[PDB]
Write a protein that binds this DNA or RNA. Sequence first.
DNA 1: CCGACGGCGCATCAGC
DNA 2: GCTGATGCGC
DNA 3: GTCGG
Length: 326
Amino acid sequence: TLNGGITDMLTELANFEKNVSQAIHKYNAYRKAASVIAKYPHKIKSGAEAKKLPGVGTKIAEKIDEFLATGKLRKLEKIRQDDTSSSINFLTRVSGIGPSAARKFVDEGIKTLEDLRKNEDKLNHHQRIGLKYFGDFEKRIPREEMLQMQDIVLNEVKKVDSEYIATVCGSFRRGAESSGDMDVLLTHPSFTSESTKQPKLLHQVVEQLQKVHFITDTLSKGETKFMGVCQLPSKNDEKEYPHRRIDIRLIPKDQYYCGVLYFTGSDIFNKNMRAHALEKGFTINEYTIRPLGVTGVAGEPLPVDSEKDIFDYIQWKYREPKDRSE
DNA sequence: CCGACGGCGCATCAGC
DNA sequence: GCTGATGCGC
DNA sequence: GTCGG
Ligand SMILES: Nc1ncnc2c1ncn2[C@H]1C[C@H](O)[C@@H](COP(=O)(O)CP(=O)(O)OP(=O)(O)O)O1
Ligand SMILES: [Mn+2]
Ligand SMILES: [Mn+2]
Ligand SMILES: [Mn+2]
Ligand SMILES: [Mn+2]
Ligand SMILES: [Mn+2]
Ligand SMILES: [Mn+2]
Ligand SMILES: [Mn+2]
Ligand code: NA
Ligand code: NA
Ligand code: NA
Ligand code: NA
Ligand code: NA
Ligand code: NA
């Protein structure tokens, strides 16, 4: 990280616009600048130098000038000191508490962990779990633990049915040394863009994972998407492992590669690829890649049998997962 | 200069 | 009791 | 906040 100082500043500014100002587009503007700067191979020595990069405009070049000259940013100091900004920023660290709830609680005097505890009755099931594992969720997951988790999921899935295919994606697939969570992409021959809805395809797998006490809690659960909490088995007398966030998505089999691309990310990568795909006349989502008509109507789903196929369609140089960390 | 910047599955609950 | 509205996360 | 239109 030749420009870690600057990108950290841009990221903190982004979380502020998202959590406090509730301006999702400023949030995204800051992350775009941070991302583009993180890819720049030279140590930025001024705002004008950074200004050349797409995503970095007048205001960010100015903020960059102050940071290099002073080593800090006045705007961020004010933010850090402000009681409301700081409280809301802290509360959003709880899974289940977004910008709205955080602002709502603070206006009522609930601004700290203790307060959430005191007013637990006011929290919904998701927020209560988030409070319960506040520390655990902020811990990173060592890749070694991820592998152990990967073995258990594929194995338990296999038990339900040998034709299920579970693929760990997200940062893990990108080869990360550690991950914030575990993202599982699931498929089965019986569920395709046609099929006719197969009831409990995800339920069975979720159910099994709960059976062996791997999944300890549920945040959300439907026919195609599961968000929960899981935990590696604890030897016997040793220290329990930290509880971990787990997301599982069941997608149609014939849409596997678009799904793998999407769920492998990174998020910014997805944003980039989709915008680029539009420049080339295509429209991509997590399920398909379609050409855009002369008028604007999206055509039919094009065939895809590898991630590389998608890169080919948009004339982009294929990039291995480890290179999609933008 | 102004306005697009992605869109959706799931849970909750205000308004009736 | 129901559902349209909104939040949340990704 | 930024950039293309
Ligand atoms: N807002 C968004 N728009 C488009 N795509 C988005 C997205 N948020 C997440 N994604 C996609 C790409 C991520 O690799 C993938 C996993 O989503 P994720 O939130 O688990 C983050 P990950 O990249 O796994 O790193 P880590 O911090 O969890 O270890 O989901
Ligand atoms: Mn150069
Ligand atoms: Mn405020
Ligand atoms: Mn207090
Ligand atoms: Mn992840
Ligand atoms: Mn995830
Ligand atoms: Mn492009
Ligand atoms: Mn403007
Ligand atoms: Na620029
Ligand atoms: Na205070
Ligand atoms: Na949160
Ligand atoms: Na995360
Ligand atoms: Na009521
Ligand atoms: Na409804």
